């Protein structure tokens, strides 16, 4: 395990805005166990100094939900920490790779438990990008059997006042 | 994963409680009433001689 290199000169202002989650690679059981109902997710992203706010949007049983989180910077460009809010333990984050207008591959890790997630500005992703993601997975020592996709449709926006987790 | 945590699932009951019993009920009652009356009389005579 190591902190891999981020996007060179990561521009939070360009990486800002709307991302759709496309696929996740992880050894996390709950993507393979109960891997059905991988409900679609999207981020709104804003810079907030060097930290970034993120609003994940999701459905849950058809109720649209918003989770707002601060990705605190590590003091290092493109490197962030999520807090141990519920004693979950802090999650290290690296913006490994992005075309700010097109695609991103984000590295996230806690307690050596590692995930990589591929987001896009777009419904399609270039198959070359997807292939890069596959090799990113292999380099992370994750199997193809630990890659999981998310549906093309049914993204949500603007969850209700009562359906915002607002963990911060 | 969005999931439910479980820390709050049980409480220890102090010895002095014979019963402690979680149970969700609501009731509401509303009553609303209006009464209005307007009563109006005019009366007039003109007598010319």
Resolution for this PDB entry, in angstroms: 3.3
For chain A, the first-to-last Cα distance in angstroms comes to 27
Min Cα–Cα distance to chain B from A118, Å? 16
Min Cα–Cα distance to chain B from A8, Å? 30
For residue A45, list its beta bridge partners.
Answer: A17, A54
Cβ of A58 and B2 within 8 Å? yes
B3 interaction partners in chain A (CB closer than 8 Å): 30
- Exposure string of A24-57, with b = 16+ CB inside 10 Å and e = fewer, is bbbbeeebeeeeeebbbbbbbbeeeeeebbbbbb
Residue of A nearest to B7 (CA): A86
Min Cα–Cα distance to chain B from A31, Å? 8
Identify whether the C-beta of residue A28 lies closer than 8 Å to the C-beta of residue A17. no
Task: Report strand pairing: A17-26 vs A79-82.
Answer: unpaired
Distance CA B1, CA A67 (A): 12
A33: helix, coil or strand? Answer: coil
Residue of B nearest to A39 (CA): B1
Residue of B nearest to A57 (CA): B2
By what method was this entry solved? cryo-EM
Angle at Cα A84 formed by Cα A30 and Cα A162, nearest 5°?
Answer: 75
And the tokens for A122?
């777009």
A28 interaction partners in chain B (CB closer than 8 Å): 1
And the tokens for B24?
């969700």
């Amino acid at each position: 395990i190591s902190t891999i290199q981020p996007k060179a000169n990561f521009d939070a202002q360009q990486f800002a805005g709307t991302w759709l989650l496309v696929a996740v690679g992880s050894a996390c059981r709950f993507l393979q166990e109960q891997g059905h109902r991988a409900e679609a997710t999207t981020l709104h992203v804003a810079p907030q100094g060097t930290a970034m706010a993120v609003s994940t949007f999701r459905k849950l049983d058809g109720i649209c939900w918003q989770v707002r989180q601060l990705y605190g910077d590590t003091g290092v460009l493109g490197r962030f920490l999520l807090q141990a809010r519920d004693a979950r333990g802090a999650v290290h984050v690296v913006v490994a790779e992005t075309d700010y207008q097109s695609f991103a591959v984000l590295y996230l890790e806690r307690a050596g438990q590692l995930s990589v997630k591929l987001y896009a500005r777009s419904l399609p992703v270039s198959d070359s990008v997807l292939s890069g993601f596959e090799q990113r997975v292999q380099e992370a020592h994750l199997t193809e059997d630990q890659i999981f996709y998310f549906p093309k449709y049914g993204f949500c926006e603007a969850a209700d006042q009562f359906h915002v987790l607002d963990e911060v | 994963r969005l999931y439910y945590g479980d820390d709050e699932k049980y409480f220890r009951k102090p010895y002095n409680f014979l019963k402690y019993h979680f149970e969700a009920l609501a009731d509401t009652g509303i009553s609303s009433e209006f009464y209005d009356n307007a009563n109006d009389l005019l009366s007039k005579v003109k007598k010319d001689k």
